[PDB]
Amino acid sequence: EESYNPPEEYPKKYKSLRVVPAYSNLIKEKFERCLDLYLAPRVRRTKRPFPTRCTNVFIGHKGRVRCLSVHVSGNWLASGGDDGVLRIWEVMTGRCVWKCSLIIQSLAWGPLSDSPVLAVAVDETVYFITPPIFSDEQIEASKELFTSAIWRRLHGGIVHATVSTPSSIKSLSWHRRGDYLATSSPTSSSQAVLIHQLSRGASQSPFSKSKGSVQAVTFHPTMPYLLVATQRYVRIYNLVKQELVKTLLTGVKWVSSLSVHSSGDHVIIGSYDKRLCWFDLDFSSKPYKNLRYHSRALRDVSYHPSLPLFCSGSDDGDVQVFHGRVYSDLLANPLIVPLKILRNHKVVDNVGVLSTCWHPKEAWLFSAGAGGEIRMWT
Amino acid sequence: GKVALITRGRFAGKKVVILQAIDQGSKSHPFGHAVVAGVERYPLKVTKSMGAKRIARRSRVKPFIKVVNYNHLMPTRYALELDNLKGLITADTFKEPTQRSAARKTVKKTFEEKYQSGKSAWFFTPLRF
Amino acid sequence: PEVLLKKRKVNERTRKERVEQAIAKKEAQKKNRKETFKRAETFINNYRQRERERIRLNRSAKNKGDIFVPDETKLLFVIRIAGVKNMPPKIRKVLRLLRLSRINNAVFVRNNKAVAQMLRIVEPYVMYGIPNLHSVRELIYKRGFGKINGQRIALSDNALIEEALGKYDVISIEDIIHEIYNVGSHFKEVTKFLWPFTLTPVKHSLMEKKVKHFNEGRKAGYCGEEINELIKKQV
Amino acid sequence: ARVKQKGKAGAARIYITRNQALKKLQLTLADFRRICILKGVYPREPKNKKKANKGSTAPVTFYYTKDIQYLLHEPIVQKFREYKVFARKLSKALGKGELETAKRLEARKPTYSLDHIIKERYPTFHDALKDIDDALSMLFLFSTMPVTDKIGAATVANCERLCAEFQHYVIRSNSLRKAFLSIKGIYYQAEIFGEQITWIVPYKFAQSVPTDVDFRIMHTFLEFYQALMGFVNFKLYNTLGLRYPPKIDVAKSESAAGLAAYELENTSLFSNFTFFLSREVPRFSLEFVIRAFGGKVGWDPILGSGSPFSESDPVITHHICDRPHISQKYEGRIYIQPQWVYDSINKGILERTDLYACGATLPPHLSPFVEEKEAKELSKMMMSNKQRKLYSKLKNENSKNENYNNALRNRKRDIE
RNA sequence: GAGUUCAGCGCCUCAUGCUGAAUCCGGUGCGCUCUCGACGGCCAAAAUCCAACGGAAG
RNA sequence: GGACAUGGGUUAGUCGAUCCUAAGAGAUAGGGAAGCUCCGUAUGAAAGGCACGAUUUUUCGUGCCUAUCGAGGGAAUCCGGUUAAUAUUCCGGAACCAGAAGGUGGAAUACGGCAACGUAAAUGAAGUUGGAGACGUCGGCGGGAGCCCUG
């Protein structure tokens, strides 16, 4: 319907036949038609836990928050960054009462509430400090936990145990009982992973011979097994037997971090290749599902310990929230689907969401950005 | 800004320019390291007879930013400096792959502009061996 | 049940490269085929023709100021069959006066005493006759060329005809043919506007592409309605 | 048995390249294309390319080995060589000066007939009627092209003869259904034996050849279609009882009489109507279209003889004319524009004359052939082969144009 | 679950099955045989397969 | 009785041959010879195919590279059981190789480490190069296995 005067579009419109010329391209378009009949390859074909928008914006960090963590009670959040100043924010009020500064690569609170000791690792040194905000009995109980890596025993800077490692610590983990501390340093080759026992006040390397860099490390939440996320794969070692358990290949160029549910069967791992892989130990070594939501490198992924939800943070500034129900039945496969896609986060130096923390009680996500802004998506 | 060549690793025989020198030593690299951005895929010889999309595809170049030791590198008399090539090299870009990816994208864009302008022809052209 | 036709496997890049090389090789050949020799015989042949032509003019003009004046057609059709190198001065001007400046040109002429006389002067070089309406129709509708602002312009748009011939009540191609066949008042203006056609002899069968100086056996002089058949073959 | 070698079966065996197909048939490229044009032969892209190319990578056209082996026994291939023989014997005769054995040789030049090509390519008449539309577009296109050195005059005569006989058939059979207009030409559309036939008629005009079309190819297609037209029309006339070919009068044909030379020795939309054709309209298209629906047709004598009516006869119901001025306007022959006729053809309904009358604004012409966020984000990531892109391609160009033209109606009402 | 050795049963019967178990912990070699590997010296070809350089094609 | 009479018995994708060459034999190109025949096999042999192309005058143009027989060489399977006479073949059970297409999923529009090197994938034409196949002999030592010895 392109002709004299069609209202379809206004090619060209012509008032009458006289103004209508001869088409010059007709012989050409027919010439290509010929080519069709013997040159065109004739291939035949068949023709709901609501983590709502963040309403609390915590500010005060002069720089990017390297890592953020929530205490056992969940009412206090401790974060550290390259600025060297540690800020503790109250969940209920958002206050920065504990603003003592005392580059913290990571900060984690002890699994035991009766021993509220937060271990903050700056470069190659990690200090287990008991803040005065916690109860005196809790502080006293934390000191009794401790009082390869050299161990040594300021605006309320109550330092209990300081541990120095051969390499700069990148990933820090604490045992369920709190007597073991796992330090992962990708820089080191022979002693990349170090295991420190607080009861004996010493540290050692569980691996007799270490080859390859390790990007993340964690312990199983059900059995005495340690999972170390290397650059390419993740190896699970039974610390009781000091032997391997299972090796899961993420199928990515460089793994970023790993997260595990409380059951210890289904895990979600983030990679630097903008990949989010959900793997189940009872399904296969290969991931059960894969995701590439992030437009930039997938920084980290977090699964809520209680709520059946998981969150993934990336440098793209977009955080993906998914709800996943896991059933113990053999025939009931884990049903995981996305729930929300957080946005409206500032990106600086191609870095967006860096650290994401889930509330110990509800499905509330605490995300700290490169600008020192913490968004609490309740 | 000094042009350097890598004689070791996967990026063997690739010319690089020192965006930030780490020869003073670092915990990650206890040696005379150097974080430099080079060219892995040299642009193809674009012909004026080719189409605009064809010319850009041939002229496309794949950059590569990596840290290598001084011993693994080789200094050269030639040198090229760019305004966008100063201050963009840091450990944060190396630490964050997304920052590294943006750094690689920016470096390739600068190199493509350099190739389009006809500058750094010797560096742009891959070296034979 | 869906046979997707894909892109050609022709590599249009190399095709035009071959075409450009083909044109590059062709122009060199023309610039190489230069300054051929001329035998002493052709100088004679020109002289024999020139005296043969010159004597014909004297007998035609003097003592033969009589023309048989082809009748029952106001409009004739004249085409130039051949010309002689080192043209006689008289014929050289007259052919230009009839717009037949180059060989194989086709021009309409209104029949009268004057035109038939000039045709009689240049008779040994032209094949002339009476075109029928149909033959004139295909000539304009397949080989008609206009002179818009003085360039070689195809009669591709009726708007151009109206633009350049509106004030003489000529609006369309069909107006042109009706005027020309009827030889109206605007016949002179239309014929002035019309660019001469080019009926170069056609060479299809193998015998023609090989016989030397093949011109379809075109004689010179009156041919009646055979010019219509010649046009039918030619157009 | 031995370890079977690579590429000895499957996609590395059936698929055979163009160069191999040349040396297997022992042909030059130009002859190979000719037998590929005449037969039904076309490249077929293999699913696994480097597998089908002995591990190579370069882009190469492929054919079915079964297809090439059919061309090995084609009897016409011999008639290609017999002409290669004939050409050298005619060159021999002209070289020695035998201007007579040259004349007799050319009389006895070798020939090939496409009778068995047509039968083996189209078995059933319905197969022909389906795959004949391009043939109609082809032959009709050529009848208005000046004869060149590439295309012989008699071939043009074959187009004109075969073109008119088809026009006579449709008018006789009243099988014409629609006739659309465009800058391409007059898109005709009829139906025969249930199947639908469509083509395009070029504007009969003093066109120019772009000097880039390779006329060698176009010449073989005419040598193919002009064979098809004779035998397709032969069955139609035998079915309709007409004697094929219809007789042609030379004297009438040299007077631009159109269909009048040949004698055939809502179909009634214009049965009770009489039309006259003025001397400014496309008589060739209008003669065919009106007589297809019973319209009694006369035309200006300057367009050609054979007009049953004259200018003065008032029996004409509609004196069609697109000239902006009508000095001697008649009565009872209401003067309308040609777009009225085609609009009546498309709708099969007598249209309104005055809106199409002389000097009136032309009416437009019509082509007769023509929770949510969650439910849209889960299948974008939790599925493998990604056919989800079908919306992004199929729906996008339909939604945008639908949004665009719907805004045309609102914006055009604002103009009014 | 096989095999090997014990103990028992099935019964006119070509019923040739049936029931229990064990089938384990070691060491040795100027021994003998062979194999592989780090040294010391004394002084085939062809068939076939793999990889690299290379940068035509998009 | 190995005598005669009368019957039965050798089962293979994986074991060998068939596949290859060595020294040489050796047809052909040639040349001798009255002749059966002889010499000759790199020899004054036009001695084998590859790609490109809207189809090129609708008569093929352009560009590249230079026998045969003959026995150590060689892809891939073991267990248990089974007969008057059979087993890597038969049976039961368990694998491997080669080749073949399409289908699914995965990635795809390759990677990290100064490094040796490593991963689930991770374009490569013509042309160029290498390794394996494919390598002499003897003596001592280390590692293991089995036999034998012994608690």
Features:
part of a larger assembly; 4 chains; A: 378 residues; mainly beta; five-stranded antiparallel sheet; four-stranded antiparallel sheet; elongated; D: mainly alpha; 16 helices; 10% strand; flat; RNA-binding; nucleus (chain D); ribonucleoprotein complex binding (chain D); BRCT_dom (chain D)
In short:
Chain B is 29% helix and 29% strand. Chain B is α+β, with helices and mostly antiparallel strands and 129 residues long.
List the SSEs and their pairings.
This is part of a larger assembly, with chains A (378 residues), B (129 residues), C (235 residues) and D (416 residues).
Chain A: H1 26-39, E1 42-45, E2 56-58, E3 65-70, E4 76-81, E5 87-90, E6 104-109, E7 118-122, E8 125-129, H2 136-146, E9 150-152, E10 159-164, E11 171-174, E12 180-184, E13 193-197, E14 202-204, E15 214-219, E16 225-230, E17 233-238, E18 243-249, E19 255-260, E20 266-271, E21 275-280, E22 289-291, E23 300-303, E24 309-313, E25 319-325, E26 335-342, E27 353-358, E28 365-369, E29 374-377
Chain B: E1 2-6, E2 14-22, E3 33-41, H1 52-59, E4 62-69, E5 73-79, H2 91-95, H3 97-117, H4 121-124
Antiparallel strand pairs in B: 1-2, 1-5, 2-3, 3-4
Chain D: E1 15-17, H1 18-25, H2 29-38, H3 49-52, E2 62-64, H4 65-72, H5 76-96, H6 101-107, H7 115-121, H8 125-130, H9 133-142, H10 153-173, E3 176-182, E4 185-192, E5 195-201, H11 215-239, E6 247-248, H12 250-253, E7 262-263, E8 274-277, H13 283-291, E9 296-299, E10 318-320, H14 338-347, H15 372-375, H16 389-415
Parallel strand pairs in D: 8-9, 8-10
Antiparallel strand pairs in D: 1-2, 3-4, 4-5, 6-7
Helix pairs in contact in D: 2-11, 5-6, 9-10, 10-11
Chain D binds a RNA duplex (58 and 151 nucleotides) through residues 1-6, 8-11, 18-19, 23, 27-34, 47-48, 50-51, 56-60, 80-81, 83-88, 91, 150, 213-217, 219-220, 223, 384-385.
Overview of the structural elements:
This is part of a larger assembly, with chains A (378 residues), B (129 residues), C (235 residues) and D (416 residues). With 378 residues, chain A is mainly β. In chain A, 7% of the residues lie in helices and 40% in strands. Chain A has 2 helices and 29 strands. In chain A, the strands form 7 sheets. Chain A has a 5-stranded antiparallel sheet with strand order 6-7-8-10-9, with helices on one face. In chain A, strands 2-29-28-27 form a 4-stranded antiparallel sheet, with no helix packed on it. With 235 residues, chain C is α+β, with helices and mostly antiparallel strands. In chain C, strands 8-3-2-4-9 form a 5-stranded mixed sheet. Chain C has a 3-stranded antiparallel sheet with strand order 6-5-7. In chain C, helix 5 (133-143) runs antiparallel to helix 7. The radius of gyration of chain C is 23 Å and the shape is globular. Chain C starts with a strand and ends with a helix. In chain C, 23% of the residues are buried. Chain D is mostly helical. Chain D is 44% helix and 10% strand. Chain D has 16 helices and 10 strands. Chain D has helices at 18-25, 29-38, 49-52, 65-72, 76-96, 101-107, 115-121, 125-130, 133-142, 153-173, 215-239, 250-253, 283-291, 338-347, 372-375, 389-415, and strands at 15-17, 62-64, 176-182, 185-192, 195-201, 247-248, 262-263, 274-277, 296-299, 318-320. Chain D is flat, with a radius of gyration of 28 Å. Chains A and D meet through helix 1 and strand 26 of A and helix 2, helix 9, strand 3, helix 11 and helix 16 of D. Strand 1 of chain A pairs antiparallel with strand 1 (2-5) of chain C. Chain D binds a RNA duplex (58 and 151 nucleotides) through residues 1-6, 8-11, 18-19, 23, 27-34, 47-48, 50-51, 56-60, 80-81, 83-88, 91, 150, 213-217, 219-220, 223, 384-385. Chain D: Residues 266-358 form the BRCT domain.
